[PDB]
Design an enzyme around this catalytic site. Structure first.
Site, PDB file in Angstrom:
ATOM      1  N   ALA A   1     -26.413 -84.159 -21.467  1.00 49.17           N
ATOM      2  CA  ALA A   1     -27.066 -85.242 -21.224  1.00 49.17           C
ATOM      3  C   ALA A   1     -27.283 -85.323 -19.803  1.00 49.17           C
ATOM      4  CB  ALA A   1     -28.328 -85.233 -21.798  1.00 49.17           C
TER       5      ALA A   1
ATOM      6  N   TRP B   1     -34.275 -81.805 -23.432  1.00 51.81           N
ATOM      7  CA  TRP B   1     -33.832 -80.753 -23.358  1.00 51.81           C
ATOM      8  C   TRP B   1     -32.526 -81.100 -22.926  1.00 51.81           C
ATOM      9  CZ3 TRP B   1     -38.248 -77.645 -22.454  1.00 51.81           C
ATOM     10  CH2 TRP B   1     -39.112 -77.816 -22.134  1.00 51.81           C
TER      11      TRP B   1
ATOM     12  N   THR C   1     -29.056 -79.233 -24.809  1.00 56.97           N
ATOM     13  CA  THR C   1     -29.310 -78.255 -25.702  1.00 56.97           C
ATOM     14  C   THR C   1     -27.616 -79.173 -27.164  1.00 56.97           C
ATOM     15  OG1 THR C   1     -29.723 -76.285 -24.086  1.00 56.97           O
ATOM     16  CG2 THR C   1     -27.843 -75.959 -26.371  1.00 56.97           C
TER      17      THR C   1
ATOM     18  N   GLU D   1     -21.353 -75.051 -14.451  1.00 59.96           N
ATOM     19  CA  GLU D   1     -21.914 -74.541 -14.740  1.00 59.96           C
ATOM     20  C   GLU D   1     -22.886 -73.531 -15.156  1.00 59.96           C
ATOM     21  OE1 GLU D   1     -25.304 -77.624 -15.706  1.00 59.96           O
ATOM     22  OE2 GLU D   1     -26.438 -76.388 -16.595  1.00 59.96           O
TER      23      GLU D   1
ATOM     24  N   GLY E   1     -43.630 -48.356 -28.002  1.00 57.94           N
ATOM     25  CA  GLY E   1     -44.758 -48.777 -28.910  1.00 57.94           C
ATOM     26  C   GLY E   1     -43.914 -49.565 -29.759  1.00 57.94           C
TER      27      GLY E   1
HETATM   28  C1  FAD Z   1     -50.589 -53.982 -29.860  1.00 56.56           C
HETATM   29  C2  FAD Z   1     -51.258 -52.401 -29.890  1.00 56.56           C
HETATM   30  C3  FAD Z   1     -52.072 -51.754 -30.528  1.00 56.56           C
HETATM   31  C4  FAD Z   1     -52.333 -50.237 -29.711  1.00 56.56           C
HETATM   32  N1  FAD Z   1     -54.013 -50.055 -30.370  1.00 56.56           N
HETATM   33  C5  FAD Z   1     -53.856 -48.903 -30.392  1.00 56.56           C
HETATM   34  C6  FAD Z   1     -55.074 -48.335 -30.857  1.00 56.56           C
HETATM   35  O1  FAD Z   1     -56.046 -49.355 -30.931  1.00 56.56           O
HETATM   36  N2  FAD Z   1     -54.709 -47.029 -30.285  1.00 56.56           N
HETATM   37  C7  FAD Z   1     -54.266 -45.859 -30.447  1.00 56.56           C
HETATM   38  O2  FAD Z   1     -54.698 -45.044 -30.613  1.00 56.56           O
HETATM   39  N3  FAD Z   1     -52.942 -46.319 -30.345  1.00 56.56           N
HETATM   40  C8  FAD Z   1     -52.600 -47.882 -30.990  1.00 56.56           C
HETATM   41  N4  FAD Z   1     -51.447 -48.717 -30.307  1.00 56.56           N
HETATM   42  C9  FAD Z   1     -50.210 -47.753 -29.570  1.00 56.56           C
HETATM   43  C10 FAD Z   1     -50.306 -46.748 -27.900  1.00 56.56           C
HETATM   44  O3  FAD Z   1     -51.644 -46.182 -27.314  1.00 56.56           O
HETATM   45  C11 FAD Z   1     -49.236 -46.282 -28.003  1.00 56.56           C
HETATM   46  O4  FAD Z   1     -47.939 -46.090 -28.712  1.00 56.56           O
HETATM   47  C12 FAD Z   1     -48.876 -45.938 -26.567  1.00 56.56           C
HETATM   48  O5  FAD Z   1     -49.237 -45.652 -26.328  1.00 56.56           O
HETATM   49  C13 FAD Z   1     -47.257 -44.901 -27.043  1.00 56.56           C
HETATM   50  O6  FAD Z   1     -46.938 -44.828 -28.167  1.00 56.56           O
HETATM   51  P1  FAD Z   1     -45.409 -44.869 -28.408  1.00 56.56           P
HETATM   52  O7  FAD Z   1     -45.033 -45.663 -28.215  1.00 56.56           O
HETATM   53  O8  FAD Z   1     -45.048 -43.756 -29.522  1.00 56.56           O
HETATM   54  O9  FAD Z   1     -44.885 -44.124 -26.895  1.00 56.56           O
HETATM   55  P2  FAD Z   1     -43.742 -43.661 -27.120  1.00 56.56           P
HETATM   56  O10 FAD Z   1     -44.230 -41.767 -26.770  1.00 56.56           O
HETATM   57  O11 FAD Z   1     -42.872 -43.309 -28.491  1.00 56.56           O
HETATM   58  O12 FAD Z   1     -42.995 -43.635 -25.861  1.00 56.56           O
HETATM   59  C14 FAD Z   1     -41.259 -43.144 -25.596  1.00 56.56           C
HETATM   60  C15 FAD Z   1     -40.677 -44.492 -24.085  1.00 56.56           C
HETATM   61  O13 FAD Z   1     -40.775 -42.437 -23.552  1.00 56.56           O
HETATM   62  C16 FAD Z   1     -41.765 -42.818 -21.918  1.00 56.56           C
HETATM   63  N5  FAD Z   1     -42.093 -41.190 -21.897  1.00 56.56           N
HETATM   64  C17 FAD Z   1     -43.179 -40.462 -23.126  1.00 56.56           C
HETATM   65  N6  FAD Z   1     -43.566 -39.244 -22.573  1.00 56.56           N
HETATM   66  C18 FAD Z   1     -42.907 -39.344 -21.133  1.00 56.56           C
HETATM   67  C19 FAD Z   1     -43.057 -38.332 -20.182  1.00 56.56           C
HETATM   68  N7  FAD Z   1     -43.616 -37.016 -20.482  1.00 56.56           N
HETATM   69  N8  FAD Z   1     -42.392 -39.239 -19.358  1.00 56.56           N
HETATM   70  C20 FAD Z   1     -41.910 -39.506 -18.962  1.00 56.56           C
HETATM   71  N9  FAD Z   1     -41.668 -40.668 -19.915  1.00 56.56           N
HETATM   72  C21 FAD Z   1     -42.289 -40.048 -21.393  1.00 56.56           C
HETATM   73  C22 FAD Z   1     -42.881 -43.923 -22.831  1.00 56.56           C
HETATM   74  O14 FAD Z   1     -43.403 -44.034 -21.514  1.00 56.56           O
HETATM   75  C23 FAD Z   1     -41.962 -45.001 -23.166  1.00 56.56           C
HETATM   76  O15 FAD Z   1     -41.374 -45.899 -22.318  1.00 56.56           O
HETATM   77  C24 FAD Z   1     -51.217 -49.693 -29.754  1.00 56.56           C
HETATM   78  C25 FAD Z   1     -49.817 -50.054 -29.753  1.00 56.56           C
HETATM   79  C26 FAD Z   1     -50.043 -51.343 -29.696  1.00 56.56           C
HETATM   80  C27 FAD Z   1     -48.355 -52.548 -29.468  1.00 56.56           C
HETATM   81  C1  FAD Z   2     -34.297 -73.633 -22.977  1.00 61.88           C
HETATM   82  C2  FAD Z   2     -33.140 -74.929 -22.454  1.00 61.88           C
HETATM   83  C3  FAD Z   2     -32.692 -75.530 -22.447  1.00 61.88           C
HETATM   84  C4  FAD Z   2     -31.843 -76.797 -22.034  1.00 61.88           C
HETATM   85  N1  FAD Z   2     -30.937 -77.094 -21.469  1.00 61.88           N
HETATM   86  C5  FAD Z   2     -30.605 -77.849 -21.455  1.00 61.88           C
HETATM   87  C6  FAD Z   2     -29.323 -78.602 -20.682  1.00 61.88           C
HETATM   88  O1  FAD Z   2     -28.868 -78.273 -22.159  1.00 61.88           O
HETATM   89  N2  FAD Z   2     -28.941 -79.215 -20.600  1.00 61.88           N
HETATM   90  C7  FAD Z   2     -29.342 -80.514 -19.245  1.00 61.88           C
HETATM   91  O2  FAD Z   2     -29.101 -80.818 -18.963  1.00 61.88           O
HETATM   92  N3  FAD Z   2     -30.845 -79.348 -19.051  1.00 61.88           N
HETATM   93  C8  FAD Z   2     -31.337 -78.524 -20.204  1.00 61.88           C
HETATM   94  N4  FAD Z   2     -32.316 -77.658 -19.755  1.00 61.88           N
HETATM   95  C9  FAD Z   2     -33.483 -78.419 -18.666  1.00 61.88           C
HETATM   96  C10 FAD Z   2     -33.432 -77.703 -17.501  1.00 61.88           C
HETATM   97  O3  FAD Z   2     -32.307 -77.747 -16.305  1.00 61.88           O
HETATM   98  C11 FAD Z   2     -34.255 -78.349 -16.300  1.00 61.88           C
HETATM   99  O4  FAD Z   2     -35.396 -78.249 -17.278  1.00 61.88           O
HETATM  100  C12 FAD Z   2     -34.853 -76.971 -14.872  1.00 61.88           C
HETATM  101  O5  FAD Z   2     -33.283 -77.668 -14.433  1.00 61.88           O
HETATM  102  C13 FAD Z   2     -35.788 -77.496 -14.658  1.00 61.88           C
HETATM  103  O6  FAD Z   2     -36.512 -78.797 -15.140  1.00 61.88           O
HETATM  104  P1  FAD Z   2     -38.379 -78.991 -15.009  1.00 61.88           P
HETATM  105  O7  FAD Z   2     -38.988 -77.679 -15.475  1.00 61.88           O
HETATM  106  O8  FAD Z   2     -37.821 -80.449 -15.220  1.00 61.88           O
HETATM  107  O9  FAD Z   2     -38.052 -78.807 -13.365  1.00 61.88           O
HETATM  108  P2  FAD Z   2     -39.477 -79.089 -12.682  1.00 61.88           P
HETATM  109  O10 FAD Z   2     -39.346 -79.992 -11.456  1.00 61.88           O
HETATM  110  O11 FAD Z   2     -40.492 -80.212 -13.868  1.00 61.88           O
HETATM  111  O12 FAD Z   2     -40.174 -77.655 -12.086  1.00 61.88           O
HETATM  112  C14 FAD Z   2     -41.299 -77.127 -10.946  1.00 61.88           C
HETATM  113  C15 FAD Z   2     -41.781 -76.470 -10.271  1.00 61.88           C
HETATM  114  O13 FAD Z   2     -41.129 -76.404  -9.468  1.00 61.88           O
HETATM  115  C16 FAD Z   2     -39.988 -76.017  -9.228  1.00 61.88           C
HETATM  116  N5  FAD Z   2     -39.680 -76.839  -8.042  1.00 61.88           N
HETATM  117  C17 FAD Z   2     -38.482 -78.329  -7.878  1.00 61.88           C
HETATM  118  N6  FAD Z   2     -37.753 -78.652  -6.519  1.00 61.88           N
HETATM  119  C18 FAD Z   2     -38.781 -77.444  -6.085  1.00 61.88           C
HETATM  120  C19 FAD Z   2     -38.653 -77.832  -4.673  1.00 61.88           C
HETATM  121  N7  FAD Z   2     -37.332 -79.122  -3.907  1.00 61.88           N
HETATM  122  N8  FAD Z   2     -38.958 -76.823  -3.734  1.00 61.88           N
HETATM  123  C20 FAD Z   2     -39.195 -75.936  -4.326  1.00 61.88           C
HETATM  124  N9  FAD Z   2     -39.828 -75.498  -5.376  1.00 61.88           N
HETATM  125  C21 FAD Z   2     -38.990 -76.848  -6.295  1.00 61.88           C
HETATM  126  C22 FAD Z   2     -39.254 -75.554  -9.855  1.00 61.88           C
HETATM  127  O14 FAD Z   2     -37.990 -74.395  -9.598  1.00 61.88           O
HETATM  128  C23 FAD Z   2     -40.151 -75.668 -11.204  1.00 61.88           C
HETATM  129  O15 FAD Z   2     -40.883 -74.121 -10.782  1.00 61.88           O
HETATM  130  C24 FAD Z   2     -33.242 -76.497 -20.346  1.00 61.88           C
HETATM  131  C25 FAD Z   2     -34.590 -75.845 -21.085  1.00 61.88           C
HETATM  132  C26 FAD Z   2     -34.525 -74.778 -21.045  1.00 61.88           C
HETATM  133  C27 FAD Z   2     -36.134 -74.822 -20.759  1.00 61.88           C
END
Ligand code: FAD
Ligand code: FAD
Ligand code: FAD
Ligand code: FAD
EC number: 1.3.8.4
Lengths: 393, 393, 393, 393
Positions: A133, A165, A167, A253, A351
């Site tokens: 912590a 935070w 863990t 760490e 998809g």
């Molecule tokens: C939240 C959500 C809402 C949706 N809503 C609708 C909707 O309202 N209506 C609808 O009709 N569909 C809908 N879809 C489906 C969506 O339109 C299709 O699923 C999408 O175009 C890709 O489908 P797929 O994963 O089957 O493609 P896949 O063919 O399974 O994709 C395979 C991978 O290969 C890549 N790939 C495919 N062909 C080629 C190629 N010739 N060359 C290179 N890379 C290629 C693709 O980019 C992809 O990364 C929805 C999907 C989601 C997740």
């Molecule tokens: C899943 C999870 C597990 C965690 N487990 C642990 C744990 O086991 N132990 C522990 O000690 N902590 C833990 N943490 C906390 C974590 O270590 C800190 O929260 C982290 O370092 C950033 O904290 P913060 O959001 O408060 O930083 P903030 O200061 O609130 O961040 C603000 C933003 O400004 C940026 N920023 C900050 N200072 C500067 C600067 N000088 N210049 C430019 N940019 C800046 C940061 O990058 C960030 O984008 C955990 C957090 C998560 C999400």
């Protein structure tokens, strides 16, 4: 299943390769068929049983001295185990990292003989779960500005405040907490002091677990202290010198938790490549198209480069060479590449990648953490830049 | 709240600016305080009431002819409304897009007088919810390889098969379904035919809603047809000529749904900038650090560039200039930039960005869709490349 | 001067570290104060004297057997020397790579005893300069479609045609040329045959050196053959089996030439960091600003990651593990990162970076080559993708 | 030749389209067949004749009032002309931008009636060449820290010091120079004062032209002042108030010079696409491969997005809406996209792209400037971030 890992390129000895194989087999048997359920339920039902099983293998406290039951190995083995566990499940990987590297390593590095003998055996065996912590609601990245009070009365320090935070928060039996003993020190680093707070002490309570975007199942809570009296024996290192402990812990760490993004990228590849060679569109497997081949090439090259970087830096740190900027850079590069690879894997699935039945969304949500936890990317960039500023000045 | 939008740069007339203001006010009153609950519950409780309310404003069927109750406006107003709704909530934005652009626009472009008079009034008023079905489990991007059968017996076509990924599936009262009437045509494009399938017809049933990574609440299901008899009157365009209808619908779908990423980027900015000027670390607001200023500059410039691109292309398409490659490029660029901006916003929030109380994770999960839906990024790149290949050949 | 290189992380033995130090000292003494003049003049005046000096050190033919005067070391030493030379000067680095890896290594791997004894001693000593010719004006990436004719008459083959883009063209005393002996073979790979063409043979002439964007000084010309009679003794490997020689040469060429981008990135860092800590604006050194610190962090991390990748892959290939996809990926990743780092270095320098007095523009122009030479990036991506396609098929 | 430009999407009126066509025809006739020679020779032989020819068309002083001979048009026409000239040749484009926008616009905005009447007619006609001097060897981005002295003696100010990086330096007949009159002012902005320095005045001399990486031919020199007496009449605006003039000039300079990257991207497309459809490898045109189609799609989409952004912002600024952050963002986005597109074009050309016969290297070297000149990218990001900081504070 699990794609083979080319350990010839990684330059791993036979013992380390055997360790990787044993961990992969065990995790595929036990942890792997539970990852989706863990993510959905936001809870690991068998956390303590699994911790005992890990203790049997010896991965818990892998870097701990043998006299306490540890394996006494190096950081390379630690990142190997962390990578394998993260590959099996991201949340369990984070919990294991927090338990081992944050707690056990801190104890073995900055602990008295009595404290070691009291705590380390049970932590290594898996009976006790550890946590660290240091972050607070208002001091996340600016750790030295923590507000936890550690006033000293008699022979026992009294703590008031809260840490955020944590863990393994609700499940931790041993916790390492940093508090500001001297709130009036001119440098805020001087006020910091590390304490060993164990579960059950009066005034030490934990809030409800957080609902996170990813890494669901790694119980994260807020520690609450109200007039909790910590005996002086439970002090890591020395009073008003916890800043050095905190910084060394941060370096190690980052070095170890860099293994997590490696596991996530490996999992993304494992789930992407077979699907790309099974799913077919336009009369052929989608993997034969040039764009998909480019995606596979990019993912593979990024994974290999990050893996080599992490392994070489861990090997160097095993010898004794540990520099802050390198330990920051490894995790910075790994986290950014892991996020990109996860997005690419979701795109390759298409998809089916957008539904919760397939784990690609889980991989993305888990990978996004490592750019935030253990210090954000901006903090790591500043650390590297200031490390450069130290020279040529 | 809602950051002001510089409409002087966007080149919006006074009427369009008034439309944007009215939509923003209405959505902030009604839809905005429900987005988190919609995402968590994966269900929009007031979908039909909200649809009636939208019909009162006239945004439903905004491009439909006035004689049916539509506003008779252009595509620029359509993308304005879509952007505002997506800004309020991504899932409701997707549902609105599928209802209006996919269904009503297809009806007004490729429908008989009788079909228009029968369906359009209720769809525009909001009594009926529309949906479009063209994707199948094995034919998502290769749409021409759909397997739905549309054999003709007597005067009514009988349909057998199933369609997948239908937005507004379980809630649709009117659905536009593409089926292959002639499975033996040498070009698979010739076999395709469009039908108007209305809810309640025997043999037409829907499966359970999908559990998605993002856009939760936009009910997506699988349509199941088993010996469903569709009368010949319910045919869009002409038999064996549905490929042209499908392609024109795809172009306009990409053009309008490009407004969604704009809304998501605007929402990310709206939630990021005030927080960056409120959260303070190291003794000053985190927004004053140079890295955060660079992040803000990148997000703002990407949003402005994509907004100008989309608005200008929509203005051009209103005049009559509609090219496939431009309509693909707008959504391709917008989707990629939206994903990057969402990741950047999560990073800017930091620790609080990773919990589900703050909407940054929701923005990321919603933004990831537009690189997958309405054709993936690879498909759009191929479309643009082939459009270039058409010339200089 | 030259920034120190952390060889503890790189995992280099003492001998390799001594080799790196000796090469760095020698190059800083001789080659370094001539890089700008070489780039401006597009000519290396002391090429032959410098080659003799390199031969004295033994870096020429570092992987060649000791019996011919070579050092008999591994590929890791080769990439070390290549990296150091490229760090000193990009063009001389490319010339050295073409001389050693392309020519001497090909001879030692696919040469007869007589051919080795005739050519290797002089090439290693530095008296002769080597070059490899496989690309043609119409066949750059599609190497198997070369048009060079190698008809066989009597006991000597007669060559007609021309080869293009030959590094060390006009200065080569020994050249390895690939020609198609059997133009009617069903697979074009079968027709290819490798020949040893030495300078002075009748019919073998070279055109004028090319004027290139970068790598100026590495003399690149076009080989012209007109009825040049090559005796049958000058055949590498066996007739109609030069495809395997070409592919193995390509793999090792990529592996070794990956050292060039490492040298260029190291040079960019060497010139950037001291300037960032000397140039001051707004009352402080420009290196203290957060954006410049981020730039330094990005450049350093990319350099370290690529260096670890290349070194580990070279170590693996020394043992005997050589896979095509890894040898492609190393150079692909290194070249892309080198180009990005060069652009970043020009930006960090700012106004002074845009003039020819400072070497940042030279670094960019040199770094752009490695994404083109030895196969473009697209070719490497296709190679990796097809390597994945070989499995799971 | 020149690819057609879709002005329907850009939303250009008929007059602006005619202006673009006339400029394209004239530049293709005169400037285009000289670009390579200008780049190679680092000198524009016909600079004055070409300036007279431009003055005949009226593009010089296109935004100047009609009473002085200007066209009296808006900034959109100015960026159109700048884009066309940069498309023809980058260096001439930069010289034209510096002549018109930096000098003539500054005169028409912050000049007395007498100064306007004395200088504007000749500058617009093309007899005089203009230039603006604000940068110094030690103050490039920190402009307010300039060291030029402007002490006042009697009725004429005496100038001592030197200015650096002046475009059109040696050829300028009228120069606008910023100097610090009050070196003891508490804010350094108050000390700045603008002067009109004309060629031939005693003490005003110029150094030799710089040798630049790109934009060769746009004569850039260093101005040297030694006891040069400037009469008080030659003062722009008012004494000790030149900071506002400088800032307004910077804003308009960024807005107009954003047209340069547009021209460079258009030129890259013009040279890339026909070659991609002519060059053939593996038995088909290289443009038919999926990777090349993706490259074309990326280049085209980036060009279109940047073009829409710039055109819309220029249209807004014509009405009267000019904000610093928008004027910074347009050029920031355009410059980054232009650099990426130039690298992509070199890659698409491949081997031929690396030689100086083809202009791809020239396009890259020219495009790299706009990330440095008129304020670097970091400065623009800081400007946008501080603009955000002004609100919510
Ligand atoms: C939240 C959500 C809402 C949706 N809503 C609708 C909707 O309202 N209506 C609808 O009709 N569909 C809908 N879809 C489906 C969506 O339109 C299709 O699923 C999408 O175009 C890709 O489908 P797929 O994963 O089957 O493609 P896949 O063919 O399974 O994709 C395979 C991978 O290969 C890549 N790939 C495919 N062909 C080629 C190629 N010739 N060359 C290179 N890379 C290629 C693709 O980019 C992809 O990364 C929805 C999907 C989601 C997740
Ligand atoms: C899943 C999870 C597990 C965690 N487990 C642990 C744990 O086991 N132990 C522990 O000690 N902590 C833990 N943490 C906390 C974590 O270590 C800190 O929260 C982290 O370092 C950033 O904290 P913060 O959001 O408060 O930083 P903030 O200061 O609130 O961040 C603000 C933003 O400004 C940026 N920023 C900050 N200072 C500067 C600067 N000088 N210049 C430019 N940019 C800046 C940061 O990058 C960030 O984008 C955990 C957090 C998560 C999400
Ligand atoms: C071809 C060419 C033509 C030119 N023409 C003109 C002209 O006509 N008129 C004119 O006035 N000038 C001209 N210039 C000069 C140009 O305007 C400036 O040089 C430019 O703004 C940067 O100057 P600099 O290199 O001195 O900046 P430097 O201050 O030397 O840059 C140092 C580096 O640090 C960065 N940096 C600076 N301050 C900060 C900060 N606060 N935070 C973070 N990073 C920072 C910069 O981005 C840069 O990378 C020209 C330059 C070139 C190359
Ligand atoms: C400085 C320099 C030194 C050189 N030295 C040598 C040397 O020593 N020896 C030698 O043999 N060669 C040498 N070369 C040549 C170099 O090896 C080849 O030219 C290079 O592999 C590409 O050649 P090309 O331009 O003809 O490829 P092209 O085929 O002309 O490239 C066309 C473009 O299409 C792309 N492309 C090609 N095929 C495909 C595909 N199937 N799918 C998708 N995209 C594709 C390419 O990536 C490229 O962008 C040198 C070149 C240079 C510039």
């Amino acid at each position: 299943s699990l794609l083979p890992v080319d350990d010839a390129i990684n330059g791993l000895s036979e013992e380390q390769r055997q360790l990787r194989q044993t961990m992969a087999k065990f995790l595929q048997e036990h942890l792997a068929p539970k990852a989706q359920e863990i993510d959905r339920s936001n809870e690991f039902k068998n956390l303590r049983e699994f911790w005992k099983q890990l203790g049997n293998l010896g991965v818990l406290g892998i870097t701990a001295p043998v006299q306490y039951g540890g394996s006494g190995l190096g950081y390379l083995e630690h990142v190997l185990v962390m990578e394998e566990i993260s590959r099996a499940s991201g949340a369990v990987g984070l919990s294991y990292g927090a338990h081992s590297n944050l707690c056990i390593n801190q104890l073995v590095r900055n602990g008295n003989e009595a404290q070691k003998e009291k705590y380390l055996p049970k932590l290594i065996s898996g009976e006790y779960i550890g946590a660290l912590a240091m972050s607070e609601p208002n001091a996340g990245s600016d750790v030295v500005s923590m507000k936890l009070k550690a006033e000293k009365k008699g022979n026992h320090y009294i703590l008031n405040g809260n840490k955020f935070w944590i863990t393994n928060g609700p499940d931790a039996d041993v916790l390492i907490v940093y508090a500001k003993t001297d709130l009036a020190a001119v440098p805020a680093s001087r006020g910091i002091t590390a304490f060993i707070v164990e579960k059950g002490m009066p005034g030490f309570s934990t809030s409800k677990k957080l609902d996170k975007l990813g890494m669901r199942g790694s119980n994260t809570c807020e520690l609450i202290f109200e007039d909790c009296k910590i005996p002086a024996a439970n002090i890591l290192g020395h009073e008003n010198k916890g800043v050095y402990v905190l910084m060394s812990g941060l370096d190690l760490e980052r070095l170890v938790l860099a293994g997590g993004p490696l596991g996530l990228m490996q999992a993304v590849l494992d789930h992407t490549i077979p699907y790309l060679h099974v799913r077919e569109a336009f009369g052929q497997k989608i993997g034969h198209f040039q764009l998909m081949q480019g995606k596979m090439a990019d993912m593979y090259t990024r994974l290999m480069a990050c893996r080599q970087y992490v392994y070489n830096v861990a090997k160097a740190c095993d010898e004794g060479h540990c520099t802050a900027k390198d330990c920051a850079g490894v995790i910075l590069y790994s986290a950014e590449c892991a996020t990109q690879v996860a997005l690419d894997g979701i795109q390759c699935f298409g998809g089916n990648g957008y539904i919760n039945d397939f784990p690609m969304g889980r991989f993305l949500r888990d990978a996004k953490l490592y750019e935030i936890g253990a210090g954000t990317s901006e903090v790591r960039r500043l650390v590297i830049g200031r490390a450069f500023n130290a020279d040529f000045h």
